[PDB]
Symmetry: C4
Subunit: 156 residues, 4 copies
């Protein structure tokens, strides 16, 4: 097994949790091909974000919420929707398919790294910035889906 960073280990879990149908090894081919697929993917991610406390194996805290934005041509216009846990009202989204540039879902998760316990140390803090992108910049009929993260580390 190849070693990765703590953030990366967490990120793999994030891909399984937020990306519908995701499976290991499909990172650079994972994509959407229909409107329904793109809708299900977006909703699944948000639903999962809202259900996180009752399903995740990790212990992530929200950091207020979630921004669902879609960028399309009117000039590029960004159109964002806010989702404040604890749960909805956003399932009436209408994608500007013909004008679509991309769609992004952005949110942050806060957590502790418990590996410190084995060495009798107070765990330090990790705040993950999650960005899920449905990229349509190639306007090719194929929209690749990706999830990347960035971590802010500091003592709690």
């Amino acid at each position: 097994q190849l070693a990765v960073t703590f953030r990366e280990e967490n990120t793999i879990a994030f891909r399984h949790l937020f990306l519908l149908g995701y499976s290991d090894g499909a990172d650079d081919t994972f994509a959407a091909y229909t409107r329904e697929q793109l809708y299900q993917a977006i909703f699944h991610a948000v639903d999962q974000y809202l259900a996180l406390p009752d399903v995740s194996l990790g212990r992530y805290a929200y950091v207020r919420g979630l921004a669902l934005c879609q960028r399309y041509y009117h000039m590029v216009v960004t159109d964002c929707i806010q989702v404040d846990p604890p749960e909805s009202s956003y399932k009436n989204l209408t994608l500007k398919f013909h004008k679509l540039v991309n769609v992004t879902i952005h949110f942050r998760l806060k957590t502790i790294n418990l590996q410190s316990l084995i060495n009798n140390e107070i765990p330090d803090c990790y705040t993950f910035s999650v960005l899920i992108t449905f990229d349509n910049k190639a306007h090719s009929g194929r929209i690749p889906i990706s999830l990347e993260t960035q971590a802010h580390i500091q003592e709690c």
Copy 2:
């Protein structure tokens, strides 16, 4: 990620949309083994062609329609059926299994390449000629299925 041409990017989307059960990396093994599979595959492709506007993530225009042909031994006889969107009457197809040479579904899709917008340029036009082949020339009990395209580019 390996770069491919615009036509090729579009073609990958076409394989996911028109080939039933298709999945990346199965291009040279993708095939049919039963009559039902061959029937479902053909119908799925045509149905998808008819539903294109309500499902595709790309913006393809029809170019009048779709030709469903089957070639079999009487001398090789070609037997074509026309499908003019916007939708049917062709689901009563009867495949000459024992005589079957192949079956092809041919149609063209017209679209614009919006990548021009980022450089403030008028998009040029692409007309894709789609050919789906169910090849039975080996008469081996295995019919490989393939989708290939050709593009006609010009200013709109």
Copy 3:
């Protein structure tokens, strides 16, 4: 695509048709792990043999029928059941699991190689001897399943 013989092309179709859940590239790992799986596999193969005319994309003729045998310890005892198309009475099979050596399904399919037509030649004849084996000789709790063939060629 790697060239194989006509028999081999046909054999690939046979694996898709008679082996339940079979998929390309799983030939040397394909196996059964439960009694139900082993029962479903055996029945699926026989059912498929009986339905062959209404489902196969090839044109295979029976050569009278099908022998379902199981070998187990009493000395190794072979216990065969006959299936004469056109269809049953064999679904009451009781596998000597604890004593099981293996199980084999044997039958022959006769057909013509139509590739001759393109060169205006009378097709020669192929008689395939199909042998499906559920090997339990390792008595390891894992029974690998395999299908192999042999061809008898001659003018019709």
Copy 4:
């Protein structure tokens, strides 16, 4: 096919039987990402252990039973549950998710190696010690699942 030991052949069967959704080649990526998945996995393993006689293709004898333990932070506390075939009362398990270190399912299976018969020899005895681990020591939101075994061999 690569040769492995008798124990290893048996172990592969054990992975297919006790690990939910397991498939060949996924050994070092196989993991759980949700509470429900972790619950289903644990229950599936135990249920399978209890049903073993009616489903397995091997002939394994119990060696009294099965220990379902979970380790979590109060200091690391181990909390075990006993399952004595022939069947339950353990499906009311409550996982200390936030405190979870790991979870292990331990049991032993006894059997004979019938390969001796082909050489007219009395089979020797194998007692497999099975250990299924749901490792959460990385506290990364991803819990890798693994099954390993050890064998005690001796004349019966």
